[PDB]
Amino acid sequence: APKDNTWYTGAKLGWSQHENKLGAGAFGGYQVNPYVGFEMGYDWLGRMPYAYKAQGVQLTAKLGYPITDDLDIYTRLGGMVWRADTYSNVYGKNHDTGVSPVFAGGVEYAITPEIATRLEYQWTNGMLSLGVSYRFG
Numbered sequence: 625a626p627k628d629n630t631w632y633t634g635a636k637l638g639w640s641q642h643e644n645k646l647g648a649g650a651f652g653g654y655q656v657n658p659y660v661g662f663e664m665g666y667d668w669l670g671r672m673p674y675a676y677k678a679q680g681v682q683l684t685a686k687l688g689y690p691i692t693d694d695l696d697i698y699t700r701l702g703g704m705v706w707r708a709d710t711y712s713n714v715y716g717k718n719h720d721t722g723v724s725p726v727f728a729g730g731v732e733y734a735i736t737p738e739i740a741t742r743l744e745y746q747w748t749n750g751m752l753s754l755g756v757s758y759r760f761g
């Protein structure tokens with residue numbers, strides 16, 4: 625994990641489920657100790673051919689543990705404010721907003737002290753994503 629009392633920022637590519645949606649996101653966080661950090665994220669998803677767009681902003685606690693010196697397993701839990709925009713040909717544009725709990729599980733690999741990648745599955749009550757972050761130290 626990032627050094628205690630330090631910040632990080634990252635970006636991701638995401639995918640959820642015919643129907644496939646792809647998009648991207650950004651996140652920023654503050655690490656307290658090797659097991660606990662907090663993060664704020666923004667992600668969007670768009671429907672791929674053969675406007676359905678969704679966006680969400682979230683704030684979560686991130687709890688993790690080192691599987692190895694370089695690999696952490698982690699979970700995130702918190703809330704998300706979302707917006708989904710639609711485009712119909714009959715009814716024009718539309719959108720709905722909501723608030724929901726949000727969860728995630730993932731693995732993060734510290735490539736260098738400054739750079740880490742992550743692989744995550746996020747769900748609510750899913751979206752797979754790959755990302756990279758920069759640790760300010």
Ligand SMILES: CCCCCCCCOCCOCCOCCOCCO
Pocket residue numbers: 637638639743752753754
């Ligand atoms: C931005 C995409 C990131 C996706 C990479 C995650 C891939 C890593 O492996 C995770 C496990 O593989 C899961 C497979 O996808 C679900 C399969 O079934 C879907 C069709 O019904």
Ligand SMILES: CCCCCCCCOCCOCCOCCOCCO
Pocket residue numbers: 635636648649650666
């Ligand atoms: C939610 C946006 C989608 C995420 C896009 C991925 C972009 C990843 O971040 C790129 C790396 O960060 C930028 C670096 O700072 C230097 C840029 O040049 C300076 C200003 O002109």
Ligand SMILES: CCCCCCCCOCCOCCOCCOCCO
Pocket residue numbers: 629654662663683684685701702
């Ligand atoms: C549900 C998650 C809520 C999000 C948590 C917000 C976390 C709050 O901010 C963390 C960043 O603020 C930094 C702390 O102050 C510095 C502490 O003194 C340093 C040495 O112990």
Ligand SMILES: CCCCCCCCOCCOCCOCCOCCO
Pocket residue numbers: 659687688689697698699729730
């Ligand atoms: C999804 C997996 C992530 C689950 C998060 C784990 C929660 C983090 O805190 C666990 C408690 O921290 C204690 C661990 O360090 C100590 C162990 O014993 C010492 C060496 O043998």
Ligand SMILES: CCCCCCCCOCCOCCOCCOCCO
Pocket residue numbers: 650666681682683702703704705723
């Ligand atoms: C507790 C559930 C709510 C989650 C808190 C998130 C609160 C954050 O602010 C939400 C309002 O801000 C609007 C977001 O759109 C802009 C985001 O940043 C742009 C892309 O990088």
Ligand SMILES: CCCCCCCCOCCOCCOCCOCCO
Pocket residue numbers: 687699701727747748749
């Ligand atoms: C103590 C280690 C940290 C692990 C705690 C993380 C807690 C994670 O679980 C939260 C509960 O998960 C929510 C699941 O319910 C919704 C599932 O999807 C709807 C059916 O397909």
